Design a binder for this molecule. Structure first.
Ligand SMILES: CC(=O)O[C@H](C(=O)O)c1ccccc1Cl
Ligand SMILES: CC(=O)O[C@H](C(=O)O)c1ccccc1Cl
Lengths: 319, 319
């Protein structure tokens, strides 16, 4: 349960987890694992005011894809938009678990969020989810008026594997020459299918997200080692040339996160490629500080969320 | 803005509405009218904790029908269930606007809610919505295991026209001989397409729900006068014999509601037919006190909601 330097409320949260333990998450069935995140997010009162949510199914990727469009309440007009990709190791997560996080970004930015309901793992494996995610991003750019947004002012955002997804959709958009993205918001992202960074070693345990979880997560995503080496799986492996021309990025990392180092390394690589990057480490924080509803009123977390919303606003303004 | 006897917070709410007025709701387009309720429900922080929500589409009424299944968080097993039908004059309403109300009943009862996404008016007219509502009720009884409920322990619930819907689904279930319903929860229900009760005269104006709204609501539902005279439209017109054998009812009405009298009259008719009825008038309250999120922390409203949840629990227990 925690290290020295962990923010006090976070550290109380970690101690409570260890008290009355439970099996490691990765010993559970996907169904049961999913129930854990659902339960935890439901366990606490949180503010969801100021938004309006409507479902929309689209036809893209030769497929039906469900969207949750989340819009600032009582605002008329074609608003700018950001795609939102949820985290959860590809096994876990959905819209309701992530709804508070999304609410915060939407109300903070004044922009519309389009949550993409991508297929989980291991129901599907790489690269189904990211193809869905890219397809939906293309759809919003081209048909955004159908959901009251300006598809020409378009960002991608997400936490954890969702941050992986956002980084990869921006790579697929570069690669494909479309659509134009204003911004990429990478919240404590997964960027590499390797497990040997200093932060992976330091925080393997006792900080909610564990090394054991991460490896189980990737295994459910794909066991194909050649898949894992592709930049659309591990974007940290991309070269300068491949990174060149990517949209401006805000990268937030957590001090006590196994993903910390690979997140800050990717920010470094983007920078070396001439991409505009702001890389900020939130000290005292664990993985998913901005996601976990019990931590949603922690002052540091509120400050991170005000930043993430503001920086979205900044990049989504009229030309 | 209000009468003497209106509860203080409610009366403050009414004064704020009149200040910086706006057109009557019934001068708006359905789309715009819908936006008003959506905006108002989003305008305030409310507690949505303790539930888990999942969407499920079914095939019934020769149709695809969307359900939102709302379940007490972290409870394993086949739970009892109540259908939930939202209000909004058939023109307005949906799941998110009603989600807090539903959350309260779910967490209070320990039972699962099945919200039925029936087709609005005037997109559709009577009796499309109630046929959907009945169909979905039959579906849950027969296939409830598919969504983790015991369909044999099944109630209907709703507010306003949703209360109309619940009363009518119980009549359609009687009529059809199926399914078995444990209970009917009628929250300030619409029961008659007439507009001459004392409460309609007394509170025509200045208490949020107006006579002008109610008549516009019914017109959008159906202008067919012979439809309006059917017991599946105006269940107050039903006879003792038709009412005989209906499930136990809790009816809550609001003192300052145009629907008050027809709601308490229907309770009376049920009683005269030998049906078990509890009829309770919440004094100081306007129409939809239990729905409107700005009123959700008013002590009287909390007491009404604790009652509605408890009485659901009472009727949904194992034999
Ligand atoms: C043009 C705008 O997007 O404003 C941003 C900002 O103010 O940080 C920005 C983004 C990329 C490069 C420079 C700057 Cl200044
Ligand atoms: C059997 C049960 O549903 O308990 C109810 C209650 O306690 O009010 C009830 C319902 C109908 C008739 C009598 C009673 Cl007692």
């Amino acid at each position: 349960s925690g290290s020295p330097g962990v923010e006090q409320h976070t550290q109380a949260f970690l101690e409570a987890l260890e008290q009355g333990g439970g099996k490691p998450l990765e010993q559970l069935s996907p169904k049961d694992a999913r129930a854990v995140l659902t339960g935890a997010q439901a366990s606490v009162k949180v503010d969801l005011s100021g938004i309006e949510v409507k479902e929309r199914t689209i036809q893209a990727n030769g497929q039906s894809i469900k969207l949750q469009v989340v819009r600032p309440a009582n605002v008329k007009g074609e608003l700018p938009v950001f795609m939102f990709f949820h985290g959860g190791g590809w096994v876990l997560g959905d819209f309701p678990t992530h709804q508070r996080l999304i609410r915060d970004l939407v109300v903070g930015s004044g922009a519309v969020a389009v949550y993409v309901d991508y297929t989980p793992s291991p129901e599907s494996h790489y690269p189904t989810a990211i193809n869905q995610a890219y397809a939906a991003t293309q759809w919003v750019a081209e048909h955004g008026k159908e959901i009251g947004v300006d598809g020409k002012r378009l960002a991608v955002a997400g936490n954890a594997v969702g941050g992986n997804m956002a980084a990869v959709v921006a790579l697929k958009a570069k690669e494909a020459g479309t659509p134009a993205l204003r911004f990429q918001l990478l919240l404590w992202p997964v960027t590499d299918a390797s497990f040997e960074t200093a932060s992976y070693k330091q925080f393997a345990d006792g900080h909610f997200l564990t090394t054991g979880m991460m490896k189980w997560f990737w295994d459910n995503y794909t066991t194909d080692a050649k898949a894992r080496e592709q930049i659309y799986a591990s974007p940290l492996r991309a070269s300068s040339e491949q990174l060149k021309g990517l949209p401006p990025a805000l990268v937030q990392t957590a001090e006590f996160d196994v993903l910390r180092d690979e997140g800050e390394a990717y920010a470094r690589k983007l920078n070396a490629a001439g991409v505009t990057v702001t890389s900020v480490r939130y000290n005292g924080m664990i993985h998913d500080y901005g996601l976990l509803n019990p931590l949603s009123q922690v002052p540091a977390v509120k400050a991170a969320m005000r930043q993430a919303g503001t920086e979205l606003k900044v990049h989504l303004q009229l030309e």
